[PDB]
Design a protein that fits this description.
Blueprint lengths: L2 H11 L6 E2 H10 L8 H13 L3 E5 L6 E4 L3
Antiparallel strand pairs: 1-3, 2-3
The structure holds one DNA strand.
DNA sequence: TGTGTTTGGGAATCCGGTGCCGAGGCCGCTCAATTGGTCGTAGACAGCTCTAGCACCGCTTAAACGCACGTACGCGCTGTCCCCCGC
């Protein structure tokens, strides 16, 4: 399954008012059996694609270093 | 949601009493500083030599300088996780 679903599912499972950090996303995908080490660069890209698709709102920071929430709009 | 002011309350500080022990003074003594004198020599001074430090010049080339260009490291920001702190 593509990493955009795994990320969206992790952000939905940890839904809050702040927003899953990249470190929490790493932890959730690793707990989901996804190798976050080798494919970290893929994650940053896929995450960026999800922000560029507007599917994730950046709530703090800039780019992948930030916190993110599912764009309910 | 955010900026700003206020109060009980522990903790450091001030003040007065007090008492106690070491610092300051006094005395008797002694031994080390002082006086005077002799004598030896350490070094102050003159004087002489020669070396090695300074100033200069010219030439070559290697290093320093300025500049272009790119990337990688420093630094700021965010997050988390845990391990020292206060009690």
């Amino acid at each position: 399954p593509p990493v955009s679903e795994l990320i969206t599912k992790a952000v939905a499972a940890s839904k809050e008012r702040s927003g899953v950090s990249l470190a929490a996303l790493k932890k959730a995908l690793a707990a989901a059996g996804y190798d976050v080490e080798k494919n970290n660069s893929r994650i940053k890209l896929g995450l960026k694609s999800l922000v560029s698709k507007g599917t994730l709102v950046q709530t703090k920071g800039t780019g992948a270093s930030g916190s993110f929430k599912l764009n309910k709009k």
